[PDB]
Scaffold this motif. Structure first.
Motif, mmCIF file in Angstrom:
data_model
loop_
_atom_site.group_PDB
_atom_site.id
_atom_site.type_symbol
_atom_site.label_atom_id
_atom_site.label_comp_id
_atom_site.label_asym_id
_atom_site.label_seq_id
_atom_site.Cartn_x
_atom_site.Cartn_y
_atom_site.Cartn_z
ATOM 1 N N UNK A 27 -8.459 -7.505 14.344
ATOM 2 C CA UNK A 27 -8.055 -6.217 14.873
ATOM 3 C C UNK A 27 -8.816 -5.741 16.091
ATOM 4 N N UNK A 28 -8.715 -4.443 16.279
ATOM 5 C CA UNK A 28 -9.322 -3.717 17.372
ATOM 6 C C UNK A 28 -10.833 -3.940 17.457
ATOM 7 N N UNK A 29 -11.348 -4.242 18.668
ATOM 8 C CA UNK A 29 -12.774 -4.446 18.947
ATOM 9 C C UNK A 29 -13.402 -5.503 18.043
ATOM 10 N N UNK A 30 -12.584 -6.453 17.578
ATOM 11 C CA UNK A 30 -13.027 -7.519 16.680
ATOM 12 C C UNK A 30 -12.865 -8.920 17.225
ATOM 13 N N UNK A 31 -13.092 -9.897 16.333
ATOM 14 C CA UNK A 31 -12.957 -11.316 16.634
ATOM 15 C C UNK A 31 -12.602 -12.044 15.352
ATOM 16 N N UNK A 32 -12.416 -13.374 15.432
ATOM 17 C CA UNK A 32 -12.140 -14.240 14.298
ATOM 18 C C UNK A 32 -13.246 -14.129 13.188
ATOM 19 N N UNK A 33 -14.450 -13.680 13.538
ATOM 20 C CA UNK A 33 -15.550 -13.516 12.594
ATOM 21 C C UNK A 33 -15.262 -12.488 11.495
ATOM 22 N N UNK A 34 -14.243 -11.639 11.689
ATOM 23 C CA UNK A 34 -13.805 -10.626 10.715
ATOM 24 C C UNK A 34 -13.381 -11.284 9.404
ATOM 25 N N UNK A 35 -12.863 -12.512 9.507
ATOM 26 C CA UNK A 35 -12.390 -13.325 8.385
ATOM 27 C C UNK A 35 -13.519 -14.109 7.689
ATOM 28 N N UNK A 36 -14.738 -14.046 8.222
ATOM 29 C CA UNK A 36 -15.866 -14.807 7.710
ATOM 30 C C UNK A 36 -17.132 -14.007 7.368
ATOM 31 N N UNK A 37 -17.515 -13.005 8.195
ATOM 32 C CA UNK A 37 -18.718 -12.227 7.935
ATOM 33 C C UNK A 37 -18.510 -11.291 6.726
ATOM 34 N N UNK A 38 -19.251 -11.582 5.633
ATOM 35 C CA UNK A 38 -19.197 -10.887 4.347
ATOM 36 C C UNK A 38 -17.756 -10.897 3.825
ATOM 37 N N UNK A 39 -17.024 -11.951 4.190
ATOM 38 C CA UNK A 39 -15.629 -12.115 3.849
ATOM 39 C C UNK A 39 -15.361 -13.535 3.434
ATOM 40 N N UNK A 40 -14.545 -13.687 2.390
ATOM 41 C CA UNK A 40 -14.228 -15.017 1.899
ATOM 42 C C UNK A 40 -12.780 -15.414 2.204
ATOM 43 N N UNK A 41 -12.083 -14.708 3.124
ATOM 44 C CA UNK A 41 -10.683 -15.002 3.469
ATOM 45 C C UNK A 41 -10.459 -16.451 3.882
ATOM 46 N N UNK A 42 -11.333 -17.014 4.741
ATOM 47 C CA UNK A 42 -11.219 -18.408 5.161
ATOM 48 C C UNK A 42 -11.296 -19.330 3.942
ATOM 49 N N UNK A 43 -12.283 -19.065 3.049
ATOM 50 C CA UNK A 43 -12.472 -19.813 1.820
ATOM 51 C C UNK A 43 -11.280 -19.658 0.882
ATOM 52 N N UNK A 44 -10.704 -18.444 0.786
ATOM 53 C CA UNK A 44 -9.538 -18.135 -0.034
ATOM 54 C C UNK A 44 -8.374 -18.989 0.397
ATOM 55 N N UNK A 45 -8.137 -19.115 1.706
ATOM 56 C CA UNK A 45 -7.053 -19.920 2.249
ATOM 57 C C UNK A 45 -7.261 -21.389 1.943
ATOM 58 N N UNK A 46 -8.436 -21.921 2.318
ATOM 59 C CA UNK A 46 -8.797 -23.315 2.120
ATOM 60 C C UNK A 46 -8.782 -23.719 0.643
ATOM 61 N N UNK A 47 -9.437 -22.943 -0.244
ATOM 62 C CA UNK A 47 -9.509 -23.280 -1.667
ATOM 63 C C UNK A 47 -8.154 -23.209 -2.373
ATOM 64 N N UNK A 48 -7.193 -22.474 -1.800
ATOM 65 C CA UNK A 48 -5.850 -22.352 -2.347
ATOM 66 C C UNK A 48 -4.886 -23.315 -1.699
ATOM 67 N N UNK A 49 -5.423 -24.259 -0.937
ATOM 68 C CA UNK A 49 -4.651 -25.321 -0.320
ATOM 69 C C UNK A 49 -3.949 -24.992 0.971
#
Length: 245
Positions: A27-49
């Motif tokens: 989103x606004x004033x952000x970067x791809x790190x929003x999905x990783x810093x104190x966030x498990x979204x990347x892991x959620x995607x990967x672990x769910x195939x």
């Protein structure tokens, strides 16, 4: 982040053709790190195939510049995965996503779009920032620039007018998620929440009604605030069934 830069996530252990790759749009004033810093979204995607890619767009530019950039990189991402991707887009990223697909013809590369707390009808907090600057407001929005400016309700009304009636709109399925939880006591979204309470149910940054699209599958308002709505463990299982076709 670094606008224009994108990278693929770790390759899935057991790949599935039925599982399209996901492109995560910040989103606004952000970067791809929003999905990783104190966030498990990347892991959620990967672990769910699910295979995934993460993009940095401009944190400070409008949906037109972000739409053009996103559309350009979606062509590269499509070529990389060899198939159409799903967009999971947060806050302003949901607007940049629509601009990319509709106004920059990126629909060719995308199966469907899922927006998380995207102010499709604008932000009354962005309206406030351009009338009354608040210290706490900077924590929700970031500092005033072309991107924050583009989130004003007046500006978004115009964007809606030019987008919702465009022929390209019908070519992609849209899904929206919205929160009704205001920021927890001690968070900047507590202030944004009680301010937005004048307008209606909100997640501390976006009103539930402004987080919707008339033609979208508007998924039932969840108990998320604007920051919790991107927490993988909380919303990935919610939109996971939508990650098909």
């Amino acid at each position: 982040g670094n606008p224009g830069y994108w990278f693929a996530g770790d390759p899935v252990e057991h790949p599935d053709p039925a599982k399209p790759p996901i492109v995560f749009v910040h989103g606004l004033n952000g970067s791809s790190s929003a999905w990783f810093d104190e966030n498990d979204m990347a892991e959620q995607a990967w672990k769910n195939g699910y295979d995934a890619a993460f993009i940095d767009l401009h944190p400070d530019k409008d949906m037109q510049d972000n739409g053009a950039m996103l559309a350009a990189k979606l062509r590269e991402i499509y070529q990389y995965f060899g198939r159409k991707v799903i967009l999971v887009s947060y806050s302003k990223g949901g607007i940049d996503s629509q601009s990319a697909l509709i106004h920059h013809n990126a629909y060719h590369y995308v199966e469907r779009v899922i927006t998380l707390g995207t102010p499709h009808h604008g932000s009354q907090l962005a309206d406030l920032a351009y009338s009354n600057w608040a210290g706490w407001l900077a924590d929700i929005l970031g500092q005033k620039n072309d991107a924050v400016y583009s989130l004003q309700t007046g500006f978004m009304k115009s964007f809606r007018d030019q987008t919702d009636n465009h022929p390209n709109r019908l070519k992609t399925k849209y899904f929206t998620l919205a929160g009704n939880k205001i920021g927890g006591f001690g968070s900047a979204l507590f202030f944004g929440g009680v301010y937005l309470n004048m307008f209606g149910e909100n997640d501390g940054a976006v009103t539930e009604k402004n987080a919707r699209l008339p033609y979208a599958t508007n998924l039932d308002t969840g108990k998320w605030d604007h920051f919790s709505i991107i927490k993988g463990n909380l919303t990935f299982p919610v939109f996971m069934p939508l990650l098909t076709i």
